[PDB]
Amino acid sequence: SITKVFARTIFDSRGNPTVEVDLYTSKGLFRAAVPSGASTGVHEALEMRDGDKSKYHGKSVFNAVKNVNDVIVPEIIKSGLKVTQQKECDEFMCKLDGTENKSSLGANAILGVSLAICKAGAAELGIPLYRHIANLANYDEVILPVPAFNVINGGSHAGNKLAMQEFMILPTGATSFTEAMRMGTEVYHHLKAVIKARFGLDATAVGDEGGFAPNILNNKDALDLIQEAIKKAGYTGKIEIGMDVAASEFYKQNNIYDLDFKTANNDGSQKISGDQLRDMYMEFCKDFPIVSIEDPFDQDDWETWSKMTSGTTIQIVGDDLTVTNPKRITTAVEKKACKCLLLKVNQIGSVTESIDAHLLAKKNGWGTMVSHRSGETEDCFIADLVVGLCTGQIKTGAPCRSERLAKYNQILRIEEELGSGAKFAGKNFRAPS
Amino acid sequence: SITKVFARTIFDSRGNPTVEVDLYTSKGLFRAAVPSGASTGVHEALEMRDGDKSKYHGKSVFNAVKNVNDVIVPEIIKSGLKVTQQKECDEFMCKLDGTENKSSLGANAILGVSLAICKAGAAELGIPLYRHIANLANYDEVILPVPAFNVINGGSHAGNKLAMQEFMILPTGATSFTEAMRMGTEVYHHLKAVIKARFGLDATAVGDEGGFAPNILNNKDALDLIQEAIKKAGYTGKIEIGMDVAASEFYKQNNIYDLDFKTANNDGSQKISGDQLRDMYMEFCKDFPIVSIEDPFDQDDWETWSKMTSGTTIQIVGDDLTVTNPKRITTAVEKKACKCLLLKVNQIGSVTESIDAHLLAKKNGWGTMVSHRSGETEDCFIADLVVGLCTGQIKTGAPCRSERLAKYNQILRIEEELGSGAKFAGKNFRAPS
């Protein structure tokens, strides 16, 4: 039974406030922190912000904290639900909220308690959190994921001329997670050495996810830069590439995508149509070892999504397209729009829903890439979520900044626990099962 | 009694490996991580690195981990020392090493165990870690520190033309730590809004400590930029400024300091003498609310250190000068070279030594600023160290990046524990006692 639930505000990796929940049972204290969400979102659960422009730039979360403290806490304690009853606790809070998007109490309020309950339930059962999540999703075995390291950025996420938002390296050729960390960091540092030489030390500064953002003129340069880094590290072949086009951010209208949206009066050549964009991806896939492309088209340009998923054999990740929303996931499934779900727990708002969202994707053949948010905390819950859900792939930032490393370090700790019987997703990261 | 000590490698905020120690008593697991140190250092305890150029860029720590695992662990367990005996445990390990600079086992090996033991001892006594450190240093009361937020960088730590390495804001006018976080972050975000407008979004990228590094031409511009930010935030007067000149990095010879060292063939005006440099500080102190200047002169230019400490009334912090080394601290005390010790636990290598180093400074009238390292971890131990040592001031990075926020969040948690009786150092941060 839950004896006490208490929320407070802490600060995320970007200096913004966020909810942190302290939950007690006779086993003790179980702390959980919520990552940056969307106060306003397309189909995602809405995180509650105070909006007071004076206070913390309108990003304070006193209202969400209040909701946890004098609404959720009293109710859930009086409910008499055990931390061992995840589904029920989460349903309770959902009933308590009463809205589809959790806008009455705030997804950040509901998720904080939900994560704490999950950690508590695991303790209640005397098993590790990953094992607990495994059992919740009905998995008998667990597998260590291949890390998708963010290394170079673009789009709205930086200046430069890069249209594509993210460029990541996946150590699929590694034999273990330890080796994956070794490969990932070595390349990161080799990439930094390459970037500082080609663009100067100022280009060595990092963004929200710990990746670099040199003033690269084109997407191909980004890829070549990564290639050189992989070469210097001596891992060509063992390391593959992933991308997050986030084409939604750069879609004009009627099948038009402007690869140069970052300029006023864009009357240049990079104002191509979706079909031309799709071909560009095909060209990239031919020359570069690209094994995964996230959000290649607009979140509503279904037709081109299906065309690309139909003829490429690589992983096509849905993010803005699916927003960890079962309704959106179903549609993408029916339309065969993609083959991988980017799982963001705070996008849906609760642990069981996140698990169900994943199970839905899997049931229909998709892979699942567990994802972090731009505003993370020192909480490493998703590290246990990716191992327990047996997804084989997690995208939790570059191996720089501790809100990123917090997760990777945890997975290293889990790998240690599993011992020799620790399975690394490797090449079959897409669906290790 | 210690039943089990186990080390492993994790990654710091910069992607480099570092030691993490797991220690067990009948109370359970107590985990501690060590921050980036100096493999080779002036007078500081030497952190052990493998140096294998192929493996992790020569920055791996398998040797230190090995030292903990099959040398320290067996010995300390067989010694029969309680985690409650900090001084003795630390002396034991020091005896075990046998060197002044801990170069036989590695300061990073010894400190990891030392931090774990400390957390365990606190648990053994049933008190919070801060309270435990307070009792270890003989303090009856504790006080929340004024955060010294790194906001703009320069020197070798970035490109640009800034000679001074760090520029920090200290919310001395705050009433509580909560308010200090509010002020600090609001200014941080206002500073970002100012920087992106004046220098573009690319200048918004951050460095190791989460601070910005725009291509600022001169030190005064840095100060004015901060001033504007403080103004926009509406905290002029409640927020003061600190600096870390790190003049050691920019000293030529015979009383010569080149404010433009970042250029080959520096035959320009900024090749001034220490006395001219000292005057420059005096000018800065007159116009700007600078309340603390760290490493204003070379780590061996004692004479100018004393001259400045003698005639300024502001805080003069010793870092490279003192390197948390009692011998160096004594000399600076005798010569009245400075009035504040920058405390870096991993620079000396153990918890009791760090405490003694602090007590030494205090005994002689100095203040103590608890410091983080460029390569931090998600460990928040120093947050408890600064509160327990009643120093009133901690320098643990900008309110950006979770290896920085990890500490600040912890202090927010401690503040919550103390309640209304939570004292904030405020204006008397220099020596709140």
CATH number of the domain that B57 lies in? 3.30.390.10
CA dihedral sign of residues B392, B396, B402, B406: negative
Residue A422 burial (CB < 10 Å; 0-12/13-18/19+)? Answer: middle
Contacts of A78 (CB under 8 A, 6+ apart): none
Residues 6+ apart with CB under 8 A from A24: A2, A3, A4, A5, A30
Q: Tell me whether residues A405 and B12 touch, CB distance under 8 A.
A: yes
Identify whether residues B143 and B191 lie together within a single domain: yes
Last residue of a domain, one of B69, B98, B126: B126
Known catalytic residue at B334: no
Is the four-CA dihedral B278, B279, B284, B286 of positive or negative sign?
Answer: positive
The SS3 assignment for A230 reads helix
CA A380 vs CA A103, A127, A160, B220, B371: distances in Å = 26, 17, 32, 41, 25
B residues 161-190 lying closer than 8 A (beta carbon) to A: 181-182, 185-186, 188-189
Q: Which residues of B touch A185 (CB under 8 A)?
A: 11, 15-16, 56
For residue A302, the domain's CATH number is: 3.20.20.120
Answer yes or no: do A11 and A131 share one domain: no
Alpha carbon of A306: minimum distance to chain B alpha carbons (Å) = 35
Q: How many helices (H) and strands (E) does chain B have?
A: 14, 16
- Cα separation, B396 vs A402, whole angstroms: 13
**B132 vs chain A: nearest CA distance in angstroms?**
20
Q: Three-class SS string for A286-326?
A: HHCCEEEEECCCCCCCHHHHHHHHHCCCCEEEECCCCCCCH
- Residue A412 touches partner B, C-beta closer than 8 Å: yes
Helix or strand or coil: residue B367?
strand
Q: How many Cβ atoms sit within 10 Å of the Cβ of residue B281?
A: 20
Question: Tokens for A59?
Answer: 């990003």
Please say whether the beta carbons of B423 and B430 come within 8 A.
no
- For an interface test with A, give the residue of B8, B11, B215, B376 to mutate (most A CBs within 10 A): B11
Last residue of a domain, one of B81, B99, B126: B126
SS3 B94: helix
Beta strands A166-170 and B4-11, pairing class: unpaired
SS3 category, A328: helix
Residues A239 and A354 occupy one common structural domain: yes
Residue A170 CA to residue A241 CA, distance in Å, equals 6
Q: Looking at the structure, do residues A294 and A428 belong to the same domain, yes or no? A: yes
Separation CA A81–CA A352 (nearest Å): 15
- Taking alpha carbons only, the member of A412, A332, A408, A329 closest to residue A372 is A408
Question: Which residues 6+ apart lie within 8 Å of A8 measured at CB?
Answer: A19, A20, A22, A65, B412, B413, B416
Q: 3-class DSSP state for residue A285?
A: helix
Number of domains in chain B: 2
| DSSP code per residue over A391-407 | -SEEE---S-SHHHHHH
The three-point CA angle A256-A321-A242 to 5° equals 85
The residues, ordered by sequence, that sit 6+ positions from A76 with a Cβ below 8 Å of its Cβ are A2, A5, A89, A92, A93, A113
Contact A202 B159 (CB under 8 A): yes
| CB contact at 8 A, A277 and A302 | no
Burial class (CB in 10 A: 0-12, 13-18, 19+), B309: buried
Distances (CA, A) of A282 to A167, A287, A430, B252: 16, 9, 19, 56
Residue B8 marked ligand-binding: no
Looking at the DSSP bridge assignments, the partners of residue B325 are none
For residue A9, list its beta bridge partners. A19
CA distance A362 to chain B (A): 32
Q: Is A283 on the interface with B (CB under 8 A)?
A: no
| Alpha helix segments (H runs only) across A311-374 | 326-334, 345-348, 351-363
Q: Does the CB of B55 have a partner CB in chain A at under 8 Å? A: yes
For residues B30 and B3, is the Cβ–Cβ distance under 8 A? no
Element housing B45 (H / E): none
Closest CA to B164 of B281, B41, B289, B73: B281
What does the DSSP assignment read for A179-218? HHHHHHHHHHHHHHHHHHHHH-GGGG-B-TTS-B----SS
Same domain, yes or no: A235 and A327 = yes
- B357 CB-near residues (< 8 Å, 6+ apart): B324, B325, B326, B329, B341, B343, B348
Instruction: Provide the domain limits for residue A95.
Output: 1-126
First to last CA, chain B: 33
Task: Report which of B207, B175, B174, B134 is spatially closest to residue B403, judged by C-alpha positions.
Answer: B207
Do β-strands A290-294 and A315-318 pair in parallel, antiparallel, or remain unpaired? parallel
Whole-angstrom distance, CA of residue B213 vs CA of residue B203: 7
Cβ neighbours of residue A162 closer than 8 Å, sequence gap 6 or more: A152, A153, A154, A155, A213, A216, A218, A219, A222
SS (H, E, C) B326-365: HHHHHHHHHCCCCCEEEECHHHHCCHHHHHHHHHHHHHCC
- The alpha-carbon gap from A339 to the nearest alpha carbon of chain B, in Å, equals 31
H helices, E strands: number in chain A: 14, 16
Q: How many CA atoms lie within 13 A of B359 on its CB side?
A: 14
> What is the C-alpha separation between B335 and B378, in angstroms, rounded?
38
Q: Are B382 and B407 in contact (CB under 8 A)?
A: yes
**Residues A327 and A251 both lie in one domain:** yes
Beta-bridge partner residues of A32: A21
Angle at which helices B326-334 and B302-310 cross, to 10°: 60
Contact list, A194 vs chain B (CB under 8 Å): none
Same domain, A401 and A391: yes
Provide the edge-to-edge strand list for the sheet that holds A393-395.
A146-147, A393-395, A367-371, A340-343, A315-318, A290-294, A240-244, A166-170, A149-153
Annotated binding site of A for (2R)-2-phosphoglycerate: 36, 157, 344, 373-374
Which residue out of A20, A47, A124, A209 is catalytically annotated?
A209
Tokens encoding B79:
């010694």
Q: Looking at the partner chain, which of A9, A158, A401 has a beta carbon nearest the beta carbon of B402?
A: A401
Report yes or no: A364 and A330 within 8 Å, Cβ to Cβ: no
DSSP characters for A54-86?
Answer: SGGGGT--HHHHHHIIIIIHHHHHHHT--TT-H
Whole-number Å distance between alpha carbons of A58 and A36: 14
Nearest residue of chain A to residue B201 (CA atoms)? A159
Helix, strand, or coil here: B147?
Answer: strand
Contact between B299 and B320 (Cβ < 8 Å):
yes
Partner-chain contact A15 B188, CB within 8 Å: yes
Structure tokens given for A97: 């909220």
- For A425, phi then psi, to 5°, come to -50, -35
B190 closest CA partner among B423, B417, B405, B399: B399
Q: Does A398 touch chain B (CB under 8 A)?
A: yes
Rounded-to-integer distance, Cα A214 and Cα A203, Å = 5
| B378 interaction partners in chain A (CB closer than 8 Å) | 378, 380, 402-403, 405-406, 409
Q: Which long-range contacts (CB under 8 A, 24 or more apart) does A301-308 make?
A: A301/A247, A301/A251, A301/A255, A301/A274, A302/A331, A302/A332, A302/A335, A302/A337, A304/A255, A304/A274, A304/A275, A304/A277, A304/A278, A305/A332, A305/A335, A305/A337, A305/A338, A306/A335, A306/A336, A306/A337, A307/A278, A308/A278, A308/A281
Task: Give the integer Cα–Cα distance in Å for B367 and B316.
Answer: 9
How far is the first Cα of chain A from the last one, in angstroms, to the nearest whole number? 33
Cα(A98)–Cα(A72) distance, integer angstroms? 13
Among B107, B126, B145, identify where a domain stops. B126
> Are B267 and B370 in the same domain?
yes
Whether B119 is catalytic is no
Which positions ≥6 away from A322 have C-beta within 8 Å? A328, A329, A332, A338, A341, A342
SS3 for A367? strand
Q: Which of B20, B124, B209, B240 is catalytic?
A: B209
B72 and B203 within one domain: no
Residues B244 and B348 in one domain: yes
Q: Which two tokens stand for residue A334?
A: 């029916």
Amino acid residing at A199: F
Cα A397 from Cα A404, distance rounded (Å):
5
Which position has the token pair 């490797």? A426
> Distance from B174 to chain A by nearest Cα, in Å?
15
| Contact status, residue A148 vs residue A394, Cβ threshold 8 Å | yes
Among A393, A399, A396, A355, CA closest to A379: A396
Determination technique for this PDB entry? Answer: X-ray
Same domain, A307 and A174: yes
Same domain for B96 and B245?
no
Beta bridge partners of B239: B236
Mark B310-320 as b/e (b = at least 16 C-beta within 10 Å): eebebbbbbbb
**Looking at chain A, which residue has its C-alpha nearest residue B403?**
A402
How far is A298 from A257, CA to CA, in rounded Å? 9
List phi, psi (to 5°) of A30: -130, 110
Query: How many angstroms from the chain centroid is the CA of residue B268?
Result: 34
